[PDB]
Amino acid sequence: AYTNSFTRGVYYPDKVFRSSVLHSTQDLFLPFFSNVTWFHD
């Protein structure tokens, strides 16, 4: 089984406080709208 990840899987990169700013960071993330495996096993 397969399904759509949509926009889930985002976690805070680090324990840094930021207010009302846009931050571009590169790290391990779940791709948006990716195909994720569904198990029922």
């Binding site: 805070y12 324990k15 840094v16 406080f17 930021r18 207010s19 700013v21």
Partner: protein
């Protein structure tokens, strides 16, 4: 596995050389009205400055 870490009394409203865990710098420490997340330790400005 590491030994004990020394601690010193806190000083406000005075230019001091501060060392909080791994963050080192020099400046004046004042009371803050901001709110941090429970897991967050320090805040950074828009110019990558603590």
């Amino acid at each position: 596995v590491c030994g004990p870490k020394k601690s010193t009394n806190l000083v406000k409203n005075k230019c001091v050389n501060f060392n909080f865990n791994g963050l080192t710098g020099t400046g004046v420490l004042t009371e803050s009205n901001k709110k941090f997340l429970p897991f967050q330790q320090f805040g950074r400005d828009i110019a990558d400055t603590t």
